[PDB]
């Protein structure tokens, strides 16, 4: 009876493939053919943020587009004032092994997590004047690879146990559990309306989840290796995934399959982080080859290179107003670019 | 100066944060990082216990004015290639192998062979090209009596030696050491421990001292 279900699943996959092929009449490279190229994009380093002593694994900007938070293996979570390079805060982490960090949209809280399988939320605005560990969320059986704030009380976390979770912070319990991935979930991105979110895993697939229902709406499979990063398009109707096969891929939610592939012959290293510009026309991707490329999202042509780091570019972020792009690498330096 | 009074005070706060970060980094850089690895039931628990006597589990201890950190990844059920680069730059790797596992199977093949496979994966990993391994061959007393009645030929069909502790143990050590492809960059320290010995932390101290001497010679350019 198991074979009957297996053949039903494979014929349903064939139906999925045929349905996707039916709704593919012209490629993206044909529609974006006569549009003007972006041209060579020269972005120079405006600020360099020093003070981390080990390799940096994550960063997040925040809504004010001025402050930012960075997490490093030295055990410090540093909130920087990017305009003046001042260190607003330096939180000593309980566990030195941190590989994700998020900054709340309100700015009152900051989250971190890593190999300790715990998501720690710290209260930045305390009456005592210090930064206290507001909450410790436990329940994942694998390392926390990403975490994003829905609001001051709800947080979505992805873990290496092939599972995502939605937590109510004040209660500390998992409001919802998202299952279906067969590999470690490496990154997640929240929709602009924060009602859906996409998670990329090590099974070379990306899944779209509904926050309310808790179920997976769509699955996208175009990569040939581990998906390390994911990011929605600004309009929320598409997303981009960077993987270990040295390719990025733009997928569409409404059409349900892949739109564009961003790759180059001389690029053979994986992508650690992807991000979109304010208008979505530029896709910025950090690579293992010490660099960070800037692709034309519509034309797939490479538009620029951000070569300023002496080690792997591990984290990448773009401000909400789009003024600057911050890249944090394994040489313990963040760099602001315009 | 264009700064305001509040801006000057913020810069002073940033400078204090800088000096506290420098002090914390100076304190942490004087501490030895050991990554503890091994198969299930190899004897990592016994090693952690012996060090204590003299997600991720961290063990702190002190010996001869050196502070030692062990990171027992242990119950981290995930792909090692997604988080093993976090431990690049540790002072040493402590690998635990159970000798008694030479004739035990999980699958239907010897546990010693998974020990060899994971040792080959870790020793020859691209991140740990310069990191030195500290191989622990635990359960010497169990092996000494197992070998008297169960030939080593179960695990090694090509072993032509006698069923004696010394020859079989040397052969197993040689088989594990042959998996080292980075002979010139890294060196492997092998110690034959048990559950009832007290010289393990001394051996870790000596191996770490040798690693520190070699690292200092590299820093000076004399190596």
């Amino acid at each position, epitope marked *: 009876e198991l074979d009957q279900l297996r053949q039903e699943a494979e014929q349903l996959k064939n139906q999925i493939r045929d349905a996707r092929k039916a709704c593919a009449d012209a490629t993206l490279s044909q529609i974006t053919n006569n549009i003007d190229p972006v041209g060579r994009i020269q972005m120079r380093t405006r600020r360099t943020l020093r003070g981390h002593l080990a390799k940096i694994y994550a960063m997040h900007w925040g809504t004010d587009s001025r402050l930012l938070v960075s997490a490093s293996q030295d055990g410090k979570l540093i909130i920087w004032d990017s305009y003046t390079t*001042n260190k607003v805060h330096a939180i000593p982490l309980r566990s030195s092994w941190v590989m994700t960090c998020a900054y709340a949209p309100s700015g009152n809280y900051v989250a971190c997590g890593g190999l300790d399988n715990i998501c720690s939320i710290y209260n930045l605005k305390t*009456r*005592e004047g210090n930064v206290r560990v507001s909450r410790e969320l436990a329940g994942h059986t694998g390392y926390l690879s990403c975490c994003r704030f829905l609001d001051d009380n709800q947080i979505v976390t992805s873990s290496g146990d092939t599972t995502c979770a939605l937590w109510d912070i004040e209660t500390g319990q998992q409001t919802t559990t998202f299952t279906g991935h067969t590999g470690d979930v490496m990154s997640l991105s929240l929709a602009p309306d924060t009602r859906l979110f996409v998670s990329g895993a090590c099974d070379a697939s990306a899944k779209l989840w509904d926050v309310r229902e808790g179920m997976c709406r769509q699955t996208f499979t175009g990569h040939e290796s581990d998906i390390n990063a994911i990011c929605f398009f600004p309009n929320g109707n598409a997303f981009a995934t960077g993987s270990d096969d040295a390719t990025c891929r733009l997928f569409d939610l409404r059409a349900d399959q892949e739109l564009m592939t961003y790759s180059h012959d001389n690029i053979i290293c994986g992508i650690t982080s992807v991000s979109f510009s304010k208008s979505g026309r530029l896709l910025l991707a950090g690579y293992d080859d010490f660099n960070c490329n800037v692709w034309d999202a519509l034309k797939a042509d490479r538009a620029g290179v951000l070569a300023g780091h002496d080690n792997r570019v591990s984290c990448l972020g773009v401000t909400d107003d789009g003024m600057a792009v911050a890249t944090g690498s394994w040489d313990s330096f963040l760099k602001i670019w315009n | 100066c264009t700064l305001s*009074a509040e801006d*000057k*005070a*913020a810069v*002073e706060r940033s400078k204090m944060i800088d000096r506290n970060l420098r002090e914390d980094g100076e304190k942490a850089a004087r501490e030895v990082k050991l990554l503890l690895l091994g198969a299930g039931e190899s004897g990592k628990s016994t090693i952690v216990k012996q060090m204590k006597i003299i997600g991720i589990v961290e063990t702190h201890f002190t010996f001869k004015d050196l502070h030692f950190k062990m990171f027992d990844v242990g119950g981290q059920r995930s792909e090692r290639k997604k988080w093993i680069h976090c431990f690049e730059g540790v002072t040493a790797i402590i690998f635990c192998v159970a000798l008694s596992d030479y004739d035990l199977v999980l699958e239907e093949m010897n546990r010693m062979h998974e020990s060899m496979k994971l040792f080959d994966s870790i020793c020859n990993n691209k991140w740990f090209t310069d990191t030195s391994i500290i191989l622990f061959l635990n359960k010497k007393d169990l092996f000494e009596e197992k070998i008297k009645k169960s030939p080593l030929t179960i695990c090694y069909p090509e072993y032509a030696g006698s069923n004696t502790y010394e020859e079989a143990a040397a052969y197993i050590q040689c088989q594990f050491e042959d998996l080292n492809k980075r002979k010139d960059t890294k060196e492997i320290y092998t110690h034959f421990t048990c559950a009832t010995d007290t010289k393990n932390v001394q051996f870790v101290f000596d191996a770490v001292t040798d690693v520190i001497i070699k690292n200092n010679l590299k820093d000076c350019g004399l190596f």
Partner: single-chain antibody
Amino acid sequence: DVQLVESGGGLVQPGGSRKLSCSASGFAFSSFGMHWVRQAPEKGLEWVAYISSGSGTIYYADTVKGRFTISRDDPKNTLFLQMTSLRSEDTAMYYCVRSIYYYGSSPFDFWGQGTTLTVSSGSDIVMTQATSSVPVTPGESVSISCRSSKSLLHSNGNTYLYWFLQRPGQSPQLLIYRMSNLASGVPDRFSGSGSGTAFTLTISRLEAEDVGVYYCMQHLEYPLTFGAGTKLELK
């Protein structure tokens, strides 16, 4: 919660010496700069001294420079003001005020209870509060105006204006910091506005506990100066 206690005040002969101690609890004392602020018996507030976190920078008012010395013991969580050559014009109530400085912080957040000292028998921004007092009725709207000799708007866009309320028999309370931002725990009735040298504080639907003296403060050029104060009384 956070609380500061002032001690060491009393009757002192002219030309004498005294030691005022502010003991802090409930907050990270080492991370806060500390101000000593003076209030004469029948007059308004006047800034006296300041010592930063880590004692890196120390400032005094030109009135008390040389005679007064401010220090802090972080492990003891205490703040000292040593006063020498006491003049008859130093008789007043002294407050220790905590103040933390980073991006988006609220300096002068908490004031101490104050200790009473009774001495027995240009180039500074002049904040002007023209109106000494106004009559008010509960449920109405009142506006308290302020003026500055020099523009308080900096090149970084921050307008360094602070508003305080001192209810009768109580220490001053921070309402507005940097001319726009509401302090934590302050009702949203109070709103700060203005630009450059002219400033105003607006209270909408004032309640019975809004009765007191409202002070105008600048934080741009470091010789900190207060306004004369604008008393509010009912009818």
